[PDB]
Structures are given as C-alpha cells and as structure tokens.
Symmetry: D2
Subunit: 201 residues, 4 copies
C-alpha cells in the first residue's frame, strides 16, 4: 500500500472536497496542511522546490511518489477508482455536469466579499438561481433518500454538499425555499462517515 499524502493550506478551499471523499470512503491519508503554525507561504515556496508540480499549485495528492495535481481531476480520479461516479455512461456524464455547475457557483462565492459590495447580489440573485437549478435537478429523479444521479451516492452529492456547507460558513443558512436541496444536504451531512469528519473538523 502506497502512502497517501494531501498537500494544501490550512484551509478548506479547493481541498475540502477531496478530504470529504477520503472521509466518505474512510480511506486513510496524511492531511498535510501548510501554515498550521508557521508561515504558509514559505512552506508552500519550499514545497514547490521539493515537489515536482505541473502548475505550481496545490492541492497535490501524492500516492507513493505518483504526483497528482488539480483538485477537480483528483476528484474524478478518486471517484472512478472508488465507484462514486455513477453506473452508466449517461450517469457519469450527469455527475460530471452537475460538478461542473458546482465549481462555477462555488467560484462566484469565492469571488464575493464586502469590499466588492457584491455580497447581497450573490445572496439575493446568484445563489437562489443556482439553488433552484439543483432543486430542479433533484426533481428529475424522483425515480427514499436524496441523490442527484441514479439511485446511488456520487461525488456530485458531496460537491453540492460541500458548496453549501462552505457558503454556510460565510453566510446565513439560506435553504428554506429549496426543500429537496435542504433535505439532500442534511441527508448526506448525517451519513456516519461524513458526520464524524465534520464534527472532528
């Protein structure tokens, strides 16, 4: 068995979804975070010397000496390996698509802040539009716990979960008008393995 190491900053950012997947699947790894105690940047600067990275960016997932970079690609990789990307060519596609939708609004969020005075337009206009998109998708199956794709958990379920979870750390629990989404995020929040990672966090 190869040693599994995850390199990133001492934050969620683009790394939390990978951490959730390892938790969901319960696979063990070292969660190496830069700047727990010292200067995150110096560590990162030296890391990029010591480690051979494609794009001088983290997350970096290391199995053995195999070096894997790009969080989305890591998630897709982790998901085939561990059977959470759906059971058909169509359903693999849908999961990918809804994950693509996630990283879009998830980016909009990491682009909203006080200084930019776009916090209300995010809250008032961006989010609800996207919450509605996911809501209408959970309605598409409607075919009972809550899955985006097929009748089994996929990484799109975690990604959606993580999106709203991360938003809920900046801004108010805003999912009243989206009952299916609200149910979906809680259902998955209370899966034993994820629920124990969360409270450990």
């Amino acid at each position: 068995g190869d040693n599994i190491v995850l390199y990133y900053f001492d934050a969620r950012g683009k790394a939390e979804l990978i951490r959730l997947i390892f938790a969901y699947l319960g696979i063990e790894y070292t969660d190496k975070r830069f700047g727990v105690n010292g200067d995150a940047f110096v560590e990162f600067k030296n890391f990029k010397k010591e480690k051979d990275t494609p794009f001088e960016q983290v997350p970096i997932l290391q199995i053995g000496d195999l070096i894997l970079a790009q969080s989305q690609a890591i998630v897709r990789y982790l998901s085939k390996k561990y059977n959470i990307c759906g059971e058909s060519e169509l359903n693999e596609f849908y999961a990918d698509m809804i994950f693509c939708g996630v990283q879009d609004i998830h980016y909009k969020f990491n682009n909203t802040n006080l200084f930019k005075a776009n916090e209300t337009t995010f809250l008032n206009e961006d989010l609800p539009k996207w919450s509605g998109y996911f809501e209408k998708l959970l309605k598409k199956n409607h075919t009972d716990k809550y899955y985006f794709v097929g009748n089994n958990l996929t990484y799109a379920d975690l990604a959606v979960f993580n999106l709203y979870d991360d938003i809920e750390t900046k801004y108010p629990s805003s999912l009243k008008n989206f009952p299916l989404l609200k149910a979906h995020n809680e259902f998955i929040s209370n899966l034993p393995n994820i629920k124990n990672y969360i409270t450990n966090r």
Copy 2:
C-alpha cells in the same frame, strides 16, 4: 443515428473545443449558432424556453433528444466515446489535469482586457508562466510528433491548441521562447482534419 446539434452563440468561446473535436474526429453535426443574423439574446432567451437546460447556459450538445450541457463535461464525454482520453488510468488522469490547467489560464485570458489595464500583466507574466508549465510537460515525454500524454493524440492536445489559437486572435504570436509548445501547436494545427476546419472557419 441520432441527430447531433450544438447550440451556442456565433462565437468560439467555450464551444470551440467541442467543434474542434467533431472536426478532428470528422463526425457530422449541425453547428447551430445564435445571432448569426438576429439578436443573439432573444434567440437564447427563447432557446432556454424551448430546451430543458440544467443551468440556463450554453454550450448545449444535443444527441437525439438527450440534452448535454457544460462544455468541459461534453468534452470529457466526447473523448471517452471516441478514444481520445488516453490509454491508461494514469494517462486519463494526466489529460484531465492538463485540461484543468487549460481552463484556468483560458479563463484568465477571457478576463483580460484594455479597460482593466491588465493586458500587459497577462502578456508579460501570466502567459509565459503558463506557456512554461506546458513546455515543461511536453518535456516529460520525451519518451516523433508532439503529445502531452502517452504516444497518442488526446483532447488535452486540442485544448492547449485551442487556448493559444484563441489568444492569438486577441494578442501577438508569443511562442518563440517555447519551442516544444510552438511545435505542438503547429503539429496539431496541420493535421488534415483540423487544418481544413480552421481554414473553413
């Protein structure tokens, strides 16, 4: 055989890479573009009524009545189906990763303009850093025409191609200092099927 239709605006944007893939593979489709003649927005508004889209956004790829959205997901889908995503679990991963790198700098580019006065920092600092990243990757195999992954064309080769091609429409042919990349983009530019699509464009 299902009818294949691509919906998008009368531009390259996020749709050009899909158009290149259909060209590379020579598979036939209707290239439906909004606003060739009329108001692109009205068309798009009505399109979103007539068609059931996940995220009220195009590209939309329609096979039969199957509705597929999200350009990156469409490309990954098209690539498994047609054997241009590499011949191993590792190599599928690398292609994904380098495509992830592409949509990052490709986004930076679509975020640079005159008004923002960030055209020189893009040209002077962003691009060369990224050109170097791809350069150093083409050096990793070095294992002869030019491929990013393994010894066969993958969609990462087209994506890189399309990135620089699109940049070369806004800004100057800036690839002198990156001979492998320069070779790679031309090699692929002169593949019969792509070269004929280009000149037809």
Copy 3:
C-alpha cells in the same frame, strides 16, 4: 505650454470620457493612439521608457510638460479647470458621487463577456438595477435634463459615455428609464458632441 497630448490605445476604454470632455469644451489636442500602426503593445513598451508614468498605465495626458495620469483624476482636474463640476460644495460632491457609481457599473460592464457566461445576469440584473439608480437621481434633480444643479457637469458625460459604451455591445433597455433616455439623447445632440460622435 499647451499644446496638449492624450496618449492611449486605439480604442475608447478609459480615455473616451476625456475625449468627450475635450469635445464638449472644444479643446484641441492630439489624440495619440497606440497601434494605429502595428503592435500597440510595442509602442506602449517604448512609451513607458520614454515618458515617465507614475503607475505605468494609460491614459496619460501631457499639458505642455506635466505628465497627468489616472483617468478619473484627469477628468476631475479637467472638470474643475473648465467649470463643469458643479456650482456648490454639495453639488460638486454629488457630481463626484455619481461618477463614482458610473465607474462601478462601468467596471462591471467590462467584466461581462461570452466566456464568463455572465452577460444575461448583467442584462437582466446589473444594468437594470443601475439604470434604476440613475433614474431616481434624475427625478431627485429635475424641477419644472441634468444630474446636478442647473448645468452640464461631467457626471452627465460620464453617464452618457457609460450607456453609449454599453450600446456598442448590447441591445440595452432605456425605455423603462424615460428620464435616463432623454438625458443621454440630450447630451448626444449637443453640437460639439454630436459632431465628435459623428466623427468617430
């Protein structure tokens, strides 16, 4: 000794307001534009070596021998020099406050494009919201035309420039904003401006 030279790229961008000002007033200057010839960025490279710019940006306006930089700062300087910035402390602040907001929606506009897929939210949300603000402000002002007081101020041209700019890329409603509509058309008809605009 003026003279007067405006350096920018061969485009509108951040220099257009200054051109519209020089138009309105009838100030003659050389409108030097990068890349009327070839690599705009090569001129620009050399310009940065020859002229001494504070932040390495353009527009920069040279009046005889002083290098003036930063477009909003330049337009504030020109508006005080030629009396188009309001006739009281209060009003002048107002003209300033409106220009500040113009910069914001103007930024947002040059931040929407096809690729970002944010065009329709701009057209259905950002633009209409800001057209809403400009409308009320105009209602707040017209008694018995102008944003501030009784005369042309640069807020009137800033706002005109903005909507003019947006109309080169997008359909754009203005019919739900009748007071905004008549404001911009008023400014478009002013002979110095109509002239300039017909000569672009």
Copy 4:
C-alpha cells in the same frame, strides 16, 4: 446639524479610510456597524428601507441630514473640507492621482484569495510592482515623509490604510521599499492615529 453618523458593516473594507480621516482630524462621530448584533444583512436590508441611499451601497455618511454616499467621493469631500488634499491645483491632482492608484492595488488585494489560487502572483508580482510605484513617487517628492507637497494629505492615509490592510492578511515586504516603510510608520505613530489603531 452635526452630529455625524457613519454606517457600514462591522469591518474595515471601504470605511476604514474614513475612520482614519476622522481619527487624524479628531472628528467625533458614531461609528455605526452592521451586525454588532446579529444578521448584518438584516440590518442592512432595513437600513436600505429607512435611509434613502443613491446606489444602495455603504458606507454612507450622514452629516446632520444629508446622506453622503460613495467612499472615495466621501473622502474627497472630507479632505477638501479639512485641508488635507494639497495646497495647490497641481498637488491636489497629485493626491487624487495617488488615491486612484491606491484604489487599484487595493481592489486587486480584495480580489486575491486561497480559492482563486492567485495569492502568490499578487505577493510576487502585483504588490512589489505597486510598492515600486509608491517608492518612486516618494523619491520624486522628498527634498532635504510626504507624497504631496509639505503636509499630510489623504494620499498619505490611503496608502497607509492600504498597506495596513494587506499586513492583516499577508507577510508583505516593505524592506525593499525603505521610503515607503518609513512613510507608513510615520503615519502609524501620529498620536491621533496610533491612538485609534491601538483602540481597534
């Protein structure tokens, strides 16, 4: 009748410069901050219904009964009212031009974060480039301290606020910029400011 009330969120953001100004001058006002209590955005929702704001943004500063909006416009108004905006036409433009640039690097800072993965380019490219500009400008000015002329202007505080802001999130070099370093520390020591800063 002042009085004087500053409404913002419970943070620095775009109101800090105005606080530093009120500090420097020793103006007393109520620093009303959203969410000292609960949902900041609920106060903000209600504030927008009660007060009449031009663009639905904050900060807004009420002096007796006039609602002043837009922070850069507000700071320009305050700086002319209390003589910290330069003692000639030229210098005042200069103070303006420097503030305009401060807004740009300041924007860029609040545009860098972990997720965007643009922190290191900011730290290795944007910041050092702009620290470079501020340095030369300071060299251009000191003869025998200040950005413009002979006295404190708001450009000095804007620049101080900027680097102060950046130092809450990032290491930040200033040692390669000795004239910039001594400039900000000078301003930090000024008793009105040192006091204020020690009371945050």
